[PDB]
Amino acid sequence: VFKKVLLTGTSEESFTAAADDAIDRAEDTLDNVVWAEVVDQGVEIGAVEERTYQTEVQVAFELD
Amino acid sequence: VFKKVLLTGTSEESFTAAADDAIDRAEDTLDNVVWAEVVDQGVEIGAVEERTYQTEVQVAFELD
Amino acid sequence: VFKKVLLTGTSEESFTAAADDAIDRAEDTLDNVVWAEVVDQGVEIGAVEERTYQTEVQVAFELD
Amino acid sequence: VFKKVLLTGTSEESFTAAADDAIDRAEDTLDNVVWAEVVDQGVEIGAVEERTYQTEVQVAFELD
Amino acid sequence: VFKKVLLTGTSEESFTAAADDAIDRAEDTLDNVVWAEVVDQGVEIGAVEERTYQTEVQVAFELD
Amino acid sequence: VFKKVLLTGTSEESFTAAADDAIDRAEDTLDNVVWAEVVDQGVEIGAVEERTYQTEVQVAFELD
Amino acid sequence: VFKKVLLTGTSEESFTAAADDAIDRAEDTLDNVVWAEVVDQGVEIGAVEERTYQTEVQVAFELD
Amino acid sequence: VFKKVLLTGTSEESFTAAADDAIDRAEDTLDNVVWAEVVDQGVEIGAVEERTYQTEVQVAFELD
Amino acid sequence: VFKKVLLTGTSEESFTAAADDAIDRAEDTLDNVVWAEVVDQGVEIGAVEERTYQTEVQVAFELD
Amino acid sequence: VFKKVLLTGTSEESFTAAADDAIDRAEDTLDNVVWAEVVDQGVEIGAVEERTYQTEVQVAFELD
Amino acid sequence: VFKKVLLTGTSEESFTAAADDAIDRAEDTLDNVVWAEVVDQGVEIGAVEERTYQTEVQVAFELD
Amino acid sequence: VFKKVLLTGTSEESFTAAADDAIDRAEDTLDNVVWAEVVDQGVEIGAVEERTYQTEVQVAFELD
Ligand SMILES: Cc1cc2nc3[nH]c(=O)[nH]c(=O)c3nc2cc1C
Ligand SMILES: Cc1cc2nc3[nH]c(=O)[nH]c(=O)c3nc2cc1C
Ligand SMILES: Cc1cc2nc3[nH]c(=O)[nH]c(=O)c3nc2cc1C
Ligand SMILES: Cc1cc2nc3[nH]c(=O)[nH]c(=O)c3nc2cc1C
Ligand SMILES: Cc1cc2nc3[nH]c(=O)[nH]c(=O)c3nc2cc1C
Ligand SMILES: Cc1cc2nc3[nH]c(=O)[nH]c(=O)c3nc2cc1C
Ligand SMILES: Cc1cc2nc3[nH]c(=O)[nH]c(=O)c3nc2cc1C
Ligand SMILES: Cc1cc2nc3[nH]c(=O)[nH]c(=O)c3nc2cc1C
Ligand SMILES: Cc1cc2nc3[nH]c(=O)[nH]c(=O)c3nc2cc1C
Ligand SMILES: Cc1cc2nc3[nH]c(=O)[nH]c(=O)c3nc2cc1C
Ligand SMILES: Cc1cc2nc3[nH]c(=O)[nH]c(=O)c3nc2cc1C
Ligand SMILES: Cc1cc2nc3[nH]c(=O)[nH]c(=O)c3nc2cc1C
Ligand SMILES: [Cl-]
Ligand SMILES: [Cl-]
Ligand SMILES: [Cl-]
Ligand SMILES: [Cl-]
Ligand SMILES: [Mg+2]
Ligand SMILES: [Mg+2]
Ligand SMILES: [Mg+2]
Ligand SMILES: [Mg+2]
Ligand SMILES: [Mg+2]
Ligand SMILES: [Mg+2]
Ligand SMILES: [Mg+2]
Ligand SMILES: [Mg+2]
Ligand SMILES: [Mg+2]
Ligand SMILES: [Mg+2]
Ligand SMILES: [Mg+2]
Ligand SMILES: [Mg+2]
Ligand SMILES: [Mg+2]
Ligand SMILES: [Mg+2]
């Protein structure tokens, strides 16, 4: 059985790096992370000093 | 990093109140709740005494 | 077996009340109405005296 | 010919009131507003004093 | 309030059995499981000995 | 001209059998049933003795 | 309250004419037909003498 | 950079002609119109003398 | 077994004719073409002498 | 690099078996078939002796 | 009230840079730009000297 | 007439580079490649030494 957690990563650099940021967090807290699916991308502009790229991913991990 | 939990709130009054019901529950159990996105709305009719409005939300919270 | 009818309710008050308007009509004409799923919401503005909220629902009822 | 503008209204009260807020703004600035279609709903929580309901609408107006 | 967890069940037999596999896991770990919604189906072919059917479900459970 | 009716079939056995259950009901009541399109699948768990598979289909029939 | 019926019209000429074919049938059988929304278009090729254009519409009519 | 405007054209003749009607209006008011994407089609029936075909398009134009 | 090829037909006349253009090409190169499903429509404007209607279809053909 | 082919399998038995039918055909003609994604399911009723279940899959295979 | 404009940015380098290109243009012409949502990505190949990455964004700005 | 092939490119570097990988393969094997549309993005994690970014594109090419 796989389970997914819905995470939004952030980066001041790129959408790829924002995806990595979410996956990094999943790997800190979960064993057996196997894949991630991008489900949204966006940019925060008017509440941050530098534009912040966001990539939302479903991060799948194998249970057991 | 943000994480989302998928909650369905209920209310005998309105769709807004049902959304609030889900957010209230998230705030009971989670720190740093920042926003909610409505993803579905419906009404339970034929298993309840009064119509029950349901609003499903992804509730986002900031990790750390 | 359940069947669904696709109804758009209207209200001069709210989206919840417009959903109720559709369900009320289903209950006038059908037995065993069990749930409704919201599939669209909108507002009629430029052909009515007061803004009219519309909520489109699939209204499910149990056959037999 | 109709044209649509994509507006997000806000309210501290309800999703209906947030939709009205967007339509009110369109009517301040545009003639011949005829209808609005709801395309998204959400709630701002962690940057405001009170929860703020948001309703995004395509607001249609007739040209000429 | 209901909460959903996003699980992918697997089976070497059928899509129904894969859905059951996810629900079985939810019921091992959660009280008050009430329904599941199928959101995806697929087949793993080129990393397994026998084709493996997968069914992804949102599994809803009632909180409290 | 074809018309579609939106039916949810049920089965304690499988998603295929649930689809058949809806089509069977359509064929009891309608002439010239020609095809069905699956539009949703789910499982009722926490209001039934045995898990109940549901398959929602648009069932098309030819008019005249 | 509005209700919608899901009809597929056919024509050997065009997608517009196929939409008209469905609306014509609705108007034969229903009062107060007010609008139609196109939801699908296709072409039957390998079971007919001439290509047959199909347009599926939700046809809305006002109740009462 | 391209920008899109969301226009609904109308015609008493066809969906193609309704798309053209929107593009014609864009070309009256904008330079460098480059393409249009159809996003919806429908028919107004019960507020007009003759059925009116509508085609909604995103009309793209190049900035500068 | 059916297979689909994803083709975009073009016409200076209409969306129907653009769909036909894609199907014509499929029939030049493939046996047992049975149906086509429209998946997109658009108009090329700013790289052609006359507006060019495009209709994208999945064209299904029976294998063997 | 992976490539996908869009195949509709058929079976007189089940949706799973129809998916298998498409994958079987891909494996007859292609090396390195790795996975399949279900994209549609339906039932042919009024042109066959027995109901025919159809499952449409994107079948992925690794190039080289 | 927020308003969105639908812009396609371009870059010979990356999808992130193409998103930035659209946001840069919005910021040249608009006050109070607050966020952008990615809605499409693509690559122009056969009308340019170098591949051109395109990212379409809804760019939101606060009115007043 | 345009045709599309559905390819998933891979890269250990970025989503843009993964899109390029698919387009490169199309250009090795096909004449008149004109554009690509991104349809999915994901990351392989738990079967590779380094995270592998994947970008799925429909790659369009002009026939003849
Ligand atoms: C980065 C980002 C910020 C946002 N802020 C937002 N802020 C807000 O008040 N309402 C919104 O709907 C909203 N959407 C956002 C979407 C994205 C992708
Ligand atoms: C409130 C609600 C109840 C429902 N009950 C349901 N009960 C059921 O047996 N099958 C369903 O698919 C189903 N759907 C529902 C959807 C909603 C929104
Ligand atoms: C309330 C409402 C009215 C509308 N009127 C409409 N009137 C019209 O001529 N064309 C349309 O597409 C249209 N859409 C509508 C949508 C809504 C939600
Ligand atoms: C109200 C609202 C705020 C939001 N803020 C947001 N803030 C953010 O940093 N990223 C987001 O994606 C985002 N989405 C939002 C969506 C909504 C509906
Ligand atoms: C079973 C399955 C395996 C998959 N493997 C996969 N492997 C991969 O490298 N990339 C993918 O996008 C991918 N998708 C898959 C989807 C399904 C449904
Ligand atoms: C079987 C089934 C039951 C359900 N019950 C439900 N019951 C409920 O109170 N709210 C829901 O949204 C809901 N959804 C359902 C969906 C499915 C598919
Ligand atoms: C016209 C048309 C015929 C079709 N026939 C079909 N015949 C079939 O056996 N399976 C299908 O999925 C199918 N789809 C069709 C779709 C369209 C639009
Ligand atoms: C032409 C058209 C008219 C419409 N009128 C409409 N009128 C209305 O009162 N409510 C609606 O939702 C609505 N939708 C429409 C859609 C279309 C496509
Ligand atoms: C006809 C047509 C041309 C287009 N050109 C295009 N040209 C371009 O540079 N970027 C695009 O996204 C794009 N989209 C198009 C869509 C359509 C339907
Ligand atoms: C099995 C099947 C047959 C079909 N036949 C069909 N036949 C037809 O004339 N028009 C259609 O749209 C159509 N759709 C179909 C869909 C399915 C899934
Ligand atoms: C970059 C790009 C170019 C395009 N050109 C295009 N050109 C065209 O003639 N028809 C199209 O549909 C089309 N689509 C496009 C999409 C994209 C994303
Ligand atoms: C990279 C990738 C791998 C995957 N592997 C997968 N592996 C699997 O067993 N089941 C899946 O559904 C699946 N999906 C995937 C999706 C992506 C995008
Ligand atoms: Cl828009
Ligand atoms: Cl989710
Ligand atoms: Cl329907
Ligand atoms: Cl495809
Ligand atoms: Mg930096
Ligand atoms: Mg988002
Ligand atoms: Mg009360
Ligand atoms: Mg729901
Ligand atoms: Mg009042
Ligand atoms: Mg609607
Ligand atoms: Mg207040
Ligand atoms: Mg939104
Ligand atoms: Mg076995
Ligand atoms: Mg999946
Ligand atoms: Mg049994
Ligand atoms: Mg359902
Ligand atoms: Mg003729
Ligand atoms: Mg169809």
Ligand SMILES: [Mg+2]
């Ligand atoms: Mg005329």
Ligand SMILES: [Mg+2]
């Ligand atoms: Mg519309």
Ligand SMILES: [Mg+2]
């Ligand atoms: Mg001509």
Ligand SMILES: [Mg+2]
């Ligand atoms: Mg397209």
Ligand SMILES: [Mg+2]
């Ligand atoms: Mg048999």
Ligand SMILES: [Mg+2]
């Ligand atoms: Mg299909």
Ligand SMILES: [Mg+2]
């Ligand atoms: Mg360069």
Ligand SMILES: [Mg+2]
């Ligand atoms: Mg696009």
Ligand SMILES: [Mg+2]
């Ligand atoms: Mg490297």
Ligand SMILES: [Mg+2]
């Ligand atoms: Mg994918």
Ligand code: NA
């Ligand atoms: Na989730």
Ligand code: NA
């Ligand atoms: Na817009």
Ligand code: NA
């Ligand atoms: Na219906």
Ligand code: NA
């Ligand atoms: Na394809």
